[PDB]
Amino acid sequence: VVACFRMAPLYNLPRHRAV
Amino acid sequence: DDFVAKLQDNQRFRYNEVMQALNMSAALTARKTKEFRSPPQEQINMLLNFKDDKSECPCPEEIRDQLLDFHEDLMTHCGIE
């Protein structure tokens, strides 16, 4: 269930997209 | 720039904590990683619930404080206050 739980973390995104 | 960096660091640390503690339960880990499996826009709309007192946001009090200070500085600069 680990892969299903891990879908799209915000911390993995680049800084500008998160900004 | 720095607010989102602190938020990202905390969201990574909390994910590390939940991955360490996932062995405790099966369905409680489910809500806990609901946040991490949510789409990024929903994640950040959830993390930006510092206002009022609903408290469903899991972001810590200090990170709440920098945003609450910047917001009142911006309101003072806009003249609303």
Residues 6+ apart with CB under 8 A from B81: B72, B75
Give the single-character DSSP code of B24: S
Pairwise CB contact (< 8 Å): B40 & A15: no
Rounded CA separation B18/B13 (Å): 9
Closest chain B CA to residue A16: B1
Spatial contact of B63 and B10, defined as CB atoms under 8 Å apart: yes
Give the end-to-end CA distance of chain A in Å, rounded to a whole number: 30
- Count, in order, helices (H) and strands (E) of chain B: 4, 0
β strands within chain B, DSSP E: none
Residue B22 structure tokens: 């996932």
Instruction: Count CA atoms closer than 13 A to B77's CA, side-chain side.
Output: 6
Total number of residues shown for chain A: 19
Cβ neighbourhood burial of B43 (10 Å; 0-12, 13-18, 19+) = buried
The CA distances from residue B21 to B9, B30, B34, B47, B78, in Å, are 18, 12, 15, 21, 45
Nominal resolution (angstroms):
3.3
Which among B37, B38, B63 is the top mutation candidate for probing chain A, defined by the most A β-carbons within 10 Å of its own β-carbon? B37
B9 closest CA partner among A17, A18, A1? A18
Chain B residues whose CB is inside 8 A of the A18 CB are: 4, 8, 40, 44
How many angstroms away from the CA of B43 is the closest CA of chain A?
A: 8
Locate tokens 């950040």: which residue?
B44
